[PDB]
């Protein structure tokens, strides 16, 4: 073997130029697609909030049009999924993870139009779903589509182009090129065996989609939190505790998402009409809350800067938290096309702030600023539920640019992944794939 | 399939023993990195004090500068050549071998050799980084605990070795994230699955990073301040800069390998001609560490300066070439030390220079040479050692200019792409490939 290794070392990092250039076209397509999606969502939320003015007088007619609009768009979303692409439901990350394992098809000719327009409906309707889901899956499929269109043969190409499309998909969702690469090499990739995924190829794709993102989203961060304070060493233990909390809650939150997945399957028993209508109800519920309590509906990005600043009261945070735990579950578990990734950032932030507030009054000598805990917790839920800490820590960093909080951030996210491991929790994306992969057998 | 399902449901379940031991490892590595770092600083200090007492009479102090660096350098080469040949050079290629189960981890030898050995070369003012010493001392620390607690299994051997290495990188640059990315992008077995627990590496990194912070807080390794931003119509320039780093990467590799051979002749492997050669190169570095500091030393000192545009174009070219020479002499000479940090310095300087030229060619871009400096800082690490992701993240963690992320990624990627298309190879792999082959031959 020592003789083979030598042969391999001398041959390391030599990715077929075809794969590299195709990683470029993919990244570019994924980025343009993420922009389009992002724009469509924004346009719909616009139209909807534009309707709530033509009826801002008759309050009852208003709470009605808010609901109907969100319901009609949500239903349209659930429909497209249930009718033309069942796989394009929920996140899509699990699904793409399956494809990397060669255990799930990448029906791009179906998913692309379904996941795009479908999410446009659910996200554009104000539902508690992130863009990650739609973009990472659209990304992967974009990667497959190019593979098929150029008949690029050979494992490496199939796995690499799929993995880049996924990374580019994540990158363009949060404007985080590094998180997109780390996501692939820590979570998306086959977790138990070697793989022929070219990191350098993923990079190119990410870069390309990130540039596409920048070409249309210049000068306006997704989350501007400003420069928070620093974190003294004698303050670190507090972030461990916060990690321990995210850690015991991570698994629990997973049980709920999986449980709620079942519990909600009953309401329609898989019936496309009871589903579409159930989703239409959940959708309408979100558009409603998106006017009587916005912080409980929508993606959640908006409330992050606010919570980090310490502008919410302890009471409002608990309200927002619980309410979002409910709206996230209802939207994601219901199988609506959308991610649960961003929603978790919001939950993490809120929880983190709340922890911080308490920390502040308990330790004035620490000169704390609840916001450092908000940031520390922002990716902690992604650490305890998804179990992809490195990707979370790096994602938060790329979005909140407060690198001096790196230790606290690592300590919280690590505390989370440690407590989520020691309380029986499982990588939520794996658990979902493990279910879909089982339901693909069980029925035989 | 049914297998996978069984695995998914069992994913991320690392034996609590491994995790707790990763913590002790990290803590030890960090405490070690601190001790090493302090020793180097103390020696460079003493050397400084010796010149003040013999300040008058230039030729006298130019002599004591040389001797002191020579005497410490020889002491360094000796300890390596005599008690641990493997603890020479970087140590990273070596540790990479161990992760492959292709090289031993003689910690009872390497720890004291690499530590006190590097103390001599680094403390003497040579052009070598701390990464080499710390990453290797790290892995060995990781092996030492595995052995002392008779922990059994692959996972534990690979994990504790991997974490000790990451913690080793982390405590060298105060970059926990680089430490982790290095292992999962460069260090780890590059062609087959491995039982390395990321979560365990994390804990170790954190623990050594905290150890670092308990002794170095309030003083960044590299303070460059907040640089300007980078317009999109400015990105192509970073591609070009990456293309340059990419053609120079392989070339710089050939020189390091070639200079390894060319220098082997001077002593033919003879411990005495080696120790004396090293004693010469060492003395040469402590001499330059008084008649042209920017050509000797680790190079960290000139990064902030060069990024600020405080060097003239001429001074940069001088510094560059001079450093290309001193880096090669110190590293290729097999002295215990890293070539990692020195490459940061070269990347910087080269970057600045590119910048300055960019500034005058495009006033409409309102460029600031320093953004190219930072883009290049990890670009050599990207063209030579081919670990871009770790480079980009390392620069970020040290320069804290995240708005330069696209430029940085574009330069580093341009580098790894051109280094690939010009036949270059991962310098750490090429070195291991040499070692591994020179063994079965």
């Amino acid at each position: 073997r020592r003789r083979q290794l030598i042969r391999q070392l001398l041959e390391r990092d030599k990715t077929p130029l075809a794969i590299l250039f195709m990683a470029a076209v993919v990244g570019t397509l994924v980025g343009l697609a993420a922009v389009a999606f992002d724009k469509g969502v924004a346009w719909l939320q616009n139209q909807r909030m534009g309707a709530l003015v033509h009826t801002a007088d008759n309050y009852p007619l208003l709470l009605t049009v808010a609901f109907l609009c969100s319901a009609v768009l949500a239903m349209f979303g659930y429909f497209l999924v249930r009718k033309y692409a069942p796989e394009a439901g929920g996140s899509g990350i699990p699904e793409i993870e399956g494809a990397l394992e060669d255990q799930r098809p990448v029906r791009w000719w179906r998913v692309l139009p379904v996941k795009f327009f479908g999410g446009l409906g659910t996200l554009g309707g104000g539902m508690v779903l992130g863009r990650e889901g739609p973009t990472v899956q659209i990304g992967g499929n974009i990667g497959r589509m190019v593979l098929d269109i150029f008949r690029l043969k050979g494992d490496e190409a199939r796995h690499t182009l799929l993995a880049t499309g996924a990374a580019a998909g994540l990158a363009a969702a949060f404007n985080a090129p590094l998180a997109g690469i780390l996501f692939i090499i820590e979570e998306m990739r086959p977790q138990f065996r070697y793989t022929l995924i070219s990191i350098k190829a993923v990079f190119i794709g990410v870069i390309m989609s990130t540039i596409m993102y920048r070409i249309f989203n210049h000068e306006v961060a997704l989350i501007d939190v400003g420069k928070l304070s620093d974190a003294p060493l004698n303050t670190l233990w507090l972030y461990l505790i916060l990690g321990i909390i995210f850690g015991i809650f991570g698994p629990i939150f997973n049980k709920w998402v999986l449980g709620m997945q079942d519990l909600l399957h009953r309401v329609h028993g898989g019936n496309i009409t009871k589903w579409v209508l159930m989703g239409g109800a959940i959708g309408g519920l979100c558009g409603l809350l998106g006017f009587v309590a916005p912080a409980t509906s929508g993606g959640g990005f908006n409330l992050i800067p606010i919570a980090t600043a310490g502008n919410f009261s302890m009471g409002m945070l608990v309200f927002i938290f619980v309410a979002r735990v409910i709206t996230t579950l209802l939207c994601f578990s219901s199988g609506a096309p959308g991610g649960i990734f961003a929603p978790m950032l919001a939950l993490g932030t809120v929880l983190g702030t709340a922890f911080g507030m308490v920390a502040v009054e308990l330790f004035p000598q620490y000169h704390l600023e609840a916001g450092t805990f908000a940031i520390a917790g922002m990716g902690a839920l992604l650490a305890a539920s998804i179990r992809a800490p490195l990707t979370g820590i790096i994602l938060v960093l790329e979005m909140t640019d407060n690198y001096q909080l790196i230790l606290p951030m690592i300590i919280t996210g690590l505390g989370a992944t440690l407590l989520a491991q020691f309380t029986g929790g499982k990588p939520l994306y794996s658990a979902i794939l493990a279910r879909t992969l089982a339901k693909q057998e069980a029925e035989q | 399939r049914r297998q996978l399902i069984r695995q998914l449901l069992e994913r991320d379940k690392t034996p609590l023993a491994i995790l707790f031991m990763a913590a002790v490892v990290g803590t030890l590595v960090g405490l070690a990195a601190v001790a090493f770092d302090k020793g180097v600083a103390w020696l460079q200090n003493q050397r400084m004090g010796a010149l003040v007492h013999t300040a008058d009479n230039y030729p006298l102090l130019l002599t004591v500068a040389f001797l002191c660096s020579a005497v410490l350098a020889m002491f360094g080469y000796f300890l390596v050549r005599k008690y641990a040949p493997e603890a020479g050079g970087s140590g990273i290629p070596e540790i990479e071998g161990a992760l492959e189960d292709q090289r031993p981890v003689r910690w009872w030898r390497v720890l004291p050799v690499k530590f006190f050995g590097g103390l001599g070369t680094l403390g003497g003012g040579m052009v070598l980084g701390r990464e080499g010493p710390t990453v290797q001392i790290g892995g060995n620390i990781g092996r030492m605990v595995l052995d002392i607690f008779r922990l059994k299994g692959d996972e534990a051997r690979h994990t504790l070795l991997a974490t000790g290495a990451a913690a080793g990188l982390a405590a060298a640059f105060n970059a926990p994230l680089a430490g982790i990315l290095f292992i999962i992008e460069e260090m780890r077995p590059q062609f087959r699955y491995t039982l390395i627990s990321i979560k365990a590496v994390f804990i170790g990194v954190i623990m050594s990073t905290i150890m670092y912070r308990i002794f170095n807080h309030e003083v960044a390794l590299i303070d460059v301040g907040k640089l300007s931003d980078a317009p999109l119509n400015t990105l192509w320039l970073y591609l070009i800069l990456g293309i340059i780093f990419g053609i120079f990467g392989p070339i710089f590799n050939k020189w390091v390998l070639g200079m390894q051979d060319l220098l082997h002749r001077v002593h033919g492997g003879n411990i005495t001609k080696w120790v004396l050669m090293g004693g010469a190169i060492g003395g040469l570095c402590g001499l330059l560490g008084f008649v042209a500091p920017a050509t000797s030393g680790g190079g960290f000192n000139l990064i902030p300066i060069a990024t600020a545009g405080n060097f003239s174009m001429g001074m940069l070219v001088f510094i560059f070439v001079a450093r290309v020479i001193t880096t090669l002499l110190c590293f290729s000479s097999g002295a215990p030390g890293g070539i990692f940090a020195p490459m940061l310095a070269l990347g910087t300087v080269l970057g600045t220079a590119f910048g300055m030229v960019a500034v005058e060619l495009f006033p409409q871009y309102h460029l600031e040479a320093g953004t190219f400096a930072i883009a290049g800082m990890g670009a050599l690490l990207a063209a030579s050692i081919r670990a871009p992701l770790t480079g980009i993240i390392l620069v970020l963690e040290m320069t804290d200019n995240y708005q330069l992320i696209l430029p940085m990624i574009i330069t580093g990627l341009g580098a790894t792409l051109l280094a690939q298309f010009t036949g270059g190879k991962p310098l750490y792999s090429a070195i291991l490939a040499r070692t591994l082959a020179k063994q079965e031959a």
Partner: antibody
Amino acid sequence: VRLLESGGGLVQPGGSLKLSCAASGFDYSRYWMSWVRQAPGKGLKWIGEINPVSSTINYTPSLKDKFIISRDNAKDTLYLQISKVRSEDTALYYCARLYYGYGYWYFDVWGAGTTVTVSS
Amino acid sequence: DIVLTQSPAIMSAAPGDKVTMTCSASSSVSYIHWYQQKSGTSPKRWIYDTSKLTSGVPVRFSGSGSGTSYSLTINTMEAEDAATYYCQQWSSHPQTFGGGTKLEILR
């Protein structure tokens, strides 16, 4: 780094005065500012502190509104209003930038201080 | 709030001499700081986190202690060492100061 506090002087009992502290030589923000005072021939005593964004302002255990520490980062100036001034308030007042090593904060840099005399 | 009591309230020691002053706390404290105050000038952070010297403080100066007893020490106290030293804690809020110790040049 310089801290120049002014405003001190003679104040009639029951009166109120506003002490000022002009900061220069560093980014006034990022820093928690604090007032401390030293009564003639006696020890130091913390008055209170104010974080960078004025979101937090703590005072030594004392009369509800006896002290009002405010700051204007736009003028890089710290302020200390004292009310219902009594002899106990006669003292040298120091503004001090706050910082820390391991995390147990200290009074990083102090100014020369302004003397306050409470008398009729 | 924590009461810091500095042992010798006043002490005299000739130049070149091991001088040691105590700072006892009513309760438990950690990483106390020390400030030097020369007649007519503002207090100066001398020693912090129990034993770290502030940049510029001669090495003859050292400090140590723990729990409820700390001390600042001068190995060979120079002339420009005459001053009042105040210990301060903030391991507990609100921070408190010692009554101070006046170091005078015995002659």
